[PDB]
Amino acid sequence: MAKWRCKICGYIYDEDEGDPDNGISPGTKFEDLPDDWVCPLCGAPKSEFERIE
Ligand SMILES: [Fe+3]
Numbered sequence: 001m002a003k004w005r006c007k008i009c010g011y012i013y014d015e016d017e018g019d020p021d022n023g024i025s026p027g028t029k030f031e032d033l034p035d036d037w038v039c040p041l042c043g044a045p046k047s048e049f050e051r052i053e
Contacts, residue, residue, distance in 0.1 A: 003053040004030045009042035013049065 001015035013033075018024040019040060024033065030049070038045055 001027070002030060002051055004049040005052045006039040006042060006044050007048050007050060008044040009039060011039050011041045012052070 003015070004013045005011070013019065013030060015029050016026060018026045018028045020026070022037070022040065030046070033046065035046075039048070
């Protein structure tokens with residue numbers, strides 16, 4: 001699946017790994033993250049992410 005990178009801090013959301021610490025299980029698409037999900041490292045919104053893969 002895709003990788004999305006936070007432009008502010010470089011954190012990569014990997015759809016194959018999800019974000020289990022915030023209740024997002026492996027295999028969840030970036031589009032299916034909650035509208036108000038933020039970068040776990042810097043707090044930037046989804047609008048600051050771009051697909052890198
Ligand atoms: Fe970030």
